[PDB]
Amino acid sequence: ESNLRKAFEEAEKNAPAIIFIDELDAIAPKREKTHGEVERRIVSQLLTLMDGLKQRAHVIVMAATNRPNSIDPALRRFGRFDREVDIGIPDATGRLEILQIHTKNMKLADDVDLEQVANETHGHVGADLAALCSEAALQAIRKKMDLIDLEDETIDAEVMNSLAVTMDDFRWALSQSNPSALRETVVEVPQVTWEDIGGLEDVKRELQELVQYPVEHPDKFLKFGMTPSKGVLFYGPPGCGKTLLAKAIANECQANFISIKG
Amino acid sequence: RPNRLIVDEAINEDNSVVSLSQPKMDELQLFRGDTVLLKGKKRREAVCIVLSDDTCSDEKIRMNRVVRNNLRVRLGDVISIQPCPDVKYGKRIHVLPIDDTVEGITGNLFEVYLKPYFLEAYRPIRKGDIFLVRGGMRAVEFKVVETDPSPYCIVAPDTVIHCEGEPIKREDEEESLNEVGYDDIGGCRKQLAQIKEMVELPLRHPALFKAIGVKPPRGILLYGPPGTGKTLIARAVANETGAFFFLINGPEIMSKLAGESESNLRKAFEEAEKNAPAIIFIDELDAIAPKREKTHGEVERRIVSQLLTLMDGLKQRAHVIVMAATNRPNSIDPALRRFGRFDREVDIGIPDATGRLEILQIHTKNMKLADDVDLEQVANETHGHVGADLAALCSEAALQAIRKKMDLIDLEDETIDAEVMNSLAVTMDDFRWALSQSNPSALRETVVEVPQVTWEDIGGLEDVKRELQELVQYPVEHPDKFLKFGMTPSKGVLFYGPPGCGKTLLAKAIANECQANFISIKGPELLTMWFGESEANVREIFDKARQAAPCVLFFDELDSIAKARGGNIGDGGGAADRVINQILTEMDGMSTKKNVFIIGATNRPDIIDPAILRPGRLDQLIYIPLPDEKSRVAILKANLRKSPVAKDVDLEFLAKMTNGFSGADLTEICQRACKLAIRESIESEIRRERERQTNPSAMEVEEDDPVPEIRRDHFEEAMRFARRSVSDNDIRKYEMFAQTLQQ
Amino acid sequence: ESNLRKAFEEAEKNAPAIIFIDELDAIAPKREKTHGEVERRIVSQLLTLMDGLKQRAHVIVMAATNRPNSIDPALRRFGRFDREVDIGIPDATGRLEILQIHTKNMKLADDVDLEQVANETHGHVGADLAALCSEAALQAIRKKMDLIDLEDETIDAEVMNSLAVTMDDFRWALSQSNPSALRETVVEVPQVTWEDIGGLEDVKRELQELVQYPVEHPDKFLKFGMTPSKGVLFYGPPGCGKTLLAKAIANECQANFISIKGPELLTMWFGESEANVREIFDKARQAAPCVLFFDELDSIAKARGGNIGDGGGAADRVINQILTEMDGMSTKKNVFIIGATNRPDIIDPAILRPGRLDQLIYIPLPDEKSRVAILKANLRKSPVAKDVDLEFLAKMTNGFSGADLTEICQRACKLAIRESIESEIRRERERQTNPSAMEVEEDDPVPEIRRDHFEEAMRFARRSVSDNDIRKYEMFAQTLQQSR
Ligand SMILES: Nc1ncnc2c1ncn2[C@@H]1O[C@H](COP(=O)(O)OP(=O)(O)O)[C@@H](O)[C@H]1O
Ligand SMILES: Nc1ncnc2c1ncn2[C@@H]1O[C@H](COP(=O)(O)OP(=O)(O)O)[C@@H](O)[C@H]1O
Ligand SMILES: Nc1ncnc2c1ncn2[C@@H]1O[C@H](COP(=O)(O)OP(=O)(O)O)[C@@H](O)[C@H]1O
Ligand SMILES: Nc1ncnc2c1ncn2[C@@H]1O[C@H](COP(=O)(O)OP(=O)(O)O)[C@@H](O)[C@H]1O
């Protein structure tokens, strides 16, 4: 508690300060999880300091947690942490931007297809991509260990600028790498277009009426009196094109898609 | 009472002088140069020097503006004056200037202003006094914050003063003890009325209550969802009656240090004992006194027992009232409910539509709204909100107005401060955005409120309305006749009929007519509470129905129990019987004193358990037939309000044609017609759209968009998709059951 | 522990004294709930101090607790707490006495009826009655703030003697008040007497035989060595008044009446079965003599036989616990057990065994003169007008049960209430236009329920008991008469 108090009182004097409580769930877990008494004292100290923060020099507190149900429920009353912003797993394009950010200094060979690797790899987060790139660089540099290996002065930039990391090193690094996300619900924009399906000409019209109009022209709906429909149920022979229809309408309406299986 | 005195303008301009009339002067036995205590509003004191004046009337006291600001009063108010002959000479004071008085002075205040004013002055001072000093060219305002002795001292030649320090603000943030009267609460009329009723006497007049010899209340519980404004209620009551509001916070008391926590709590109680009629507020009571089995360590038990002992130690003592706030009534240790401790329970619920409108009207006071705000719909589209959410909504609306405006390359010279708020306003789009980007916190809380469906919304059904108003209206409006004649009123009514005939409409209509609360327990929740939790949920729902009387508790889809019971599973039968049996046991425990009316509705009466249909329980059976003729016309008219009905056409033939149709079919037809009309309007708009793209500058003039042409043809095409919701054989089964009922 | 030791030591040296320990369970709970280590030390220290009272002085220790099962069972050996005294919730006469005691000081105007207030407050305890009186007094004071000068100092004397508390204040205090007992078993002598029952004289004789003689003159039974029957089982058509006979015989014997209904039994199927039944039998034994009543005894088999087959285990739980705690009972503490059921064929044969419920009494449907008797019974508290022939109504209603006749009796009074209110509304419609134009003085119409009310009630009616059920019971009775 002395450390917490010292941290807050030090941060409040330096003017527009931004405190960051990393790993919040480690010190303020769910109520029934705690067993001893020091944890209760620490949690109450944090709560009373948060309540005692009154305006000050515009100090702002951000806390990072894993899932928004492990922290104590008391840290959501008005005045305390109230705004929740999620950071989802990057999907499709996001992996491309992450890879292009990390593979900045290294001189890639002209045959490298970063887009293909981004499309192939899923269930990975930023740290996994960074580790993959690092392992690729080391794999590239090990096979050419005839450079100096003796000189106490580090390698001259000359030969070190003659390293073209190829697709083979990237594939090898991708092979021997275990992902971490895996079993996580995926929220993304499916890429299926209204050309993947060929038939169902009037079902397209029906879905268009049910979906697109409420978000385009709410004024006429609210004036005329109707409440817009909230659900649609599909039925027919097994297979056919139900899932493609759902993905296509989600793509056209430009909104996220969440799938739950039987 | 020869102490009340209306205020009046003063003759002389000296700060520490008030002019008194000779008759009162001799009546009160005052002399020249003495000191008296002046008490005003909002718990403000003042020390002055009595001066004689024949011009001033007896009822009027001559006093200047500085003392009026210090006492926070105005002309025509009443101020009590009391002699203060026990003044103690001071030894050291601290004086500081206000923020907006020393702009570009840069000099020593001791000699320029303090020395000329304080020489041979003998002016007494008190904490919180604001006084003005006249010198060369500026009116210097000074604040005295520290003195010895406090708060009474007199300036003497053998005294030391200090004026070294930063220019203090106007009043910092000390607005709470001046603001939050009854003008700052909305949508809590009944609870505030009850608190004022049961708290005014022990706090306003202690002497009479002592003389009578009756025990006052010693504890009040205010339980409700967080952010509904309980501490604000306590602050308003304490600040209005006049007391020593002394707040105790839960978490800070918990984690002070190891075993010294109870020392602080005992010190708080001791301080509150010595200091006049006071209110003690304990916030987050569940955080320090949870259930006994829940507690794991030993310090928590020590704290709980210390609280209990200090509570039971309030025998007589003084006029101290303890108020506590908690989230859930069952989360408190049941030991804190015995007589003598917290016994009176007051429920602060979620605000309703009118309450939301009142809260919004209160908060949007500093902001200068535009002439387009109609807060009625903004209030009525925010179901599931509390006070804090609405305050945050107003703040975000102001910030978004700033965003839509911005300090456009405006160099922040601090010059653009007042024209910021005095140039702007708010428009619908900002509030619609804030509503869109909002996080409600109530959601899953049972709502208690008077429904707004009236008798006109339903159509026909004269006999059923007559019977319901017979069974509900008479016993509550003329109970004397029943008591004198000696009869027991009926307690329940069961509705049975084909689905979609308008049972919940009728229940809400009678709830509106009776002007009583309404609670709805839908089928899915009832089916959920089988698997475990078959005692608790029923307990609190019945308790909530009882405490908020009058109300008409509604049980919908009562047959779902045995409907899910029958099947290929046969495992919810024990759950079914336990749920029905808690329902029955709680129903038989009702007392006629409370006007709690039970109504159950079902569409499959042949399956209901026969034990329900007994005297004392749900006994009367009322059959709702399918609408016919005039009922169909009435429901078609009821659904025909809308905004865009245009002039339209007759509705008689539509009612004449359909035979075997319920309300669901008519509402479906009404929705279909509007859907067709909207589709036509949008395709016409798209036609105009791509014809403008084909021909640029073709419609530079703003030609009117297509009107709401809800035509006969659109209606005839839309209702062409007419569906028969109900079959035919069910009518025969219902009528056979009805004929079985009659004998 | 120093405080406890000092307390007993100080009481030791100050003459015959009484030590009162309040909230005993808060310091000595069961050893299973004792989680820490300090509480075990406290309880052991208390036990040693208690056992150290050999001679010493004449010190008597009294303790108070809520749940008698919540105390550590170690505090029940001889030498320690051994005597058990139960303070129950007051009944109607007790409530009237409490109200009389707590209103001694105040001045009551000659309109309050304390009997009505006593009858309208079931479920309260003493503290609630005291709070009710206090709230009524405060309301009376607040209504008359004008007379009393609040001013600046003490009140006067004649003003206080001038205040009167009226019935309106009591009703207002009742409205804003919630009781505290509610969900508690009630042990009270019922108020129904013999005259409240129509017919059934032979059954009255049999019940009087099987309850009164063994308690009225136990000396003769001791001399002759008869073992009185422990239980009696009633069986017959529904709604013919079995509970009424039970309550009436309990009143005539002047013994406590404890009723257990079907809902409580089925709730105590799932989970809590042994503890509830044991507690019920313990409570029955403590307040002896009493007539314990079991109602809807057939609900066991009614719910057991269906499409579920999961409630049978707990049904056996309840029946087995009842048998176990019934056969091993002492009749010296008079506890007469009565069961009632309308589905006698499915009742478990183990119950119908000597030592258990053996005697079987059939309650017929009231017929002929019994109809006149019951209509006389139900028209003792209703101002029926003297123009209706009860004889023809009795002789028209062949094959009708008591509940049906009570419903018919109340229907006509409903018609009377609606007619009176309609007449009053019409009257208010008239004389609100002509100001006080009534040459003839007429009060509110006197209750004058005439023949047409009963004729209209009779037109729309019921025949609750079915004909096939009668012959089913007759066949069961003949089977019992012949096979057994
Ligand atoms: N244009 C199309 N029309 C119909 N079916 C298609 C089309 N394109 C692909 N399919 C096939 O239809 C199948 C849809 O079945 P699937 O989504 O697995 O389950 P569901 O029965 O829920 O649709 C896909 O496996 C896909 O191979
Ligand atoms: N009339 C009102 N009803 C409910 N809440 C209000 C009202 N007026 C203001 N509030 C909000 O209530 C807040 C203070 O209450 P709060 O401290 O949240 O109570 P609690 O601590 O019991 O949740 C203020 O920030 C204010 O925005
Ligand atoms: N008097 C009436 N007669 C027929 N239908 C009505 C009447 N009043 C309203 N309705 C319509 O019938 C519907 C009634 O639905 P609801 O009562 O919830 O179903 P249920 O009758 O199964 O409870 C409502 O949508 C309403 O628009
Ligand atoms: N003398 C009587 N004979 C039969 N029934 C009566 C008599 N007096 C009253 N009743 C009615 O019988 C009801 C009580 O019957 P009860 O003993 O519960 O039989 P069951 O257990 O079959 O329902 C009361 O509601 C009362 O209205």
Author numbering:
A (entry chain F): 283 to 544
B (entry chain D): 22 to 764
C (entry chain B): 283 to 766
What does the paper say about this structure?
The p97 hexamer twists as D1 and D2 oscillate, and with the same moving rhythm driven by the p97 NTD moving back and forth between the up and down conformations, the Derlin-1 channel changes its shape and size of its central tunnel and the distances from protomers γ to δ and α to β. Superposition of the structures using protomer β as a reference molecule revealed major conformational changes around the N terminus, the loop between transmembrane helices TM4 and TM5 (loop L4), as well as helices TM1 and TM2. These results showed that the Derlin-1 channel switches between a tightly closed state (tightDerΔ-p97Δ, state T) and a loose state (the major conformation shown in Figs. 1 to 3, state A). The root mean square deviation (RMSD) between states T and A was calculated as about 2.56 Å, suggesting a moderate conformation change. This dynamic change could result from a coupling between the p97 ATPase activities and the channel action during the substrate recognition and retrotranslocation or a passive motion in response to substrate passage. S10, while the α and β subunits of Derlin-1 exhibited similar overall folding and arrangement of central tunnel residues, the δ and γ subunits in state T adopted a conformation closer to the center, resulting in a tighter overall structure. At the same time, the NTDs of p97C/D are relatively flexible upon ATP hydrolysis in their D1 domains and thus act as “rotors” in driving the conformational change in the Derlin-1 channel. This leads to a transformation between states A and T, whereby an intramolecular rearrangement of the transmembrane helices occurs, resulting in a twisting or squeezing movement of the central tunnel. The relatively smaller actions in the state A to T transition may serve to extract the substrate from the ER membrane. Moreover, conformational changes in the p97 NTDs, driven by its ATPase activities, further tighten the Derlin-1 channel (state T) until extensive conformational changes in p97C/D ultimately tear the channel into state U.
